[PDB]
């Protein structure tokens with residue numbers, strides 16, 4: 001993702017090289033070019049205007065009009081604004097002695113494989129995770145998680161067809177006690193579309209299990225729809241953080257750049273490949289650098 005935006009931002013910066021000091025009108029032209037690059041990447045007008053305004057303020061504060069290398073000043077201020085847009089500092093869910101987290105999202109989001117990859121990540125960090133396959137309607141969805149848990153070496157409790165939330169809670173508590181589990185990852189039902197009956201189920205399960213995090217998994221390649229999905233889950237269930245999958249796919253890029261501003265939720269993890277280790281903690285500064293051609 002973000003190949004076109006990357007090329008357009010780098011080109012806007014590059015057009016400032018080899019010209020000496022620039023004028024106020026030159027600076028305004030570059031700012032318009034940056035806003036256009038963002039909007040072509042499907043960033044909305046409000047988000048893009050705010051971004052450019054931050055670039056303008058910071059560049060003026062760094063003396064851009066007096067610099068012999070204004071391209072470098074713009075590079076630095078775009079880098080900071082991108083790093084800010086994407087979340088600022090890297091963030092992860094808080095671990096306490098015991099933890100129960102939901103994963104929520106649509107079928108095509110990579111939610112179930114994300115649950116397994118998260119479990120593997122945390123097992124490698126010394127946690128003792130339990131996966132819970134919580135689709136009370138679809139046995140195949142539960143079996144998919146069983147098999148992935150087997151592959152990553154993490155136990156899986158599967159709910160029963162039509163099992164009540166209270167029964168799920170009892171069985172999860174029992175297994176977690178017998179197996180000394182300290183991180184419970186509940187993979188909730190995935191559907192192709194949002195559904196009143198489904199949202200009512202997720203909200204009820206949340207009341208009964210009391211998760212401390214609700215992680216919404218979104219396929220980043222779905223564009224502005226991902227922010228609409230995020231709004232629906234946050235309104236009907238309540239979300240604490242995001243996981244963006246398929247960030248390596250061919251797509252424009254603005255969900256990720258538009259998420260802090262629009263949703264107020266941190267992006268915790270990024271899916272950057274299909275390998276079992278392809279899910280990594282999200283680092284806003286490293287994505288910002290890579291968009292601008294810096295680093296790896």
Ligand SMILES: [Cl-]
Nearest residue numbers: 190191192193
């Ligand atoms: Cl479906």
Ligand SMILES: [Cl-]
Nearest residue numbers: 106109218219
């Ligand atoms: Cl999605």
Ligand SMILES: [Mn+2]
Nearest residue numbers: 203204205207
């Ligand atoms: Mn209720």
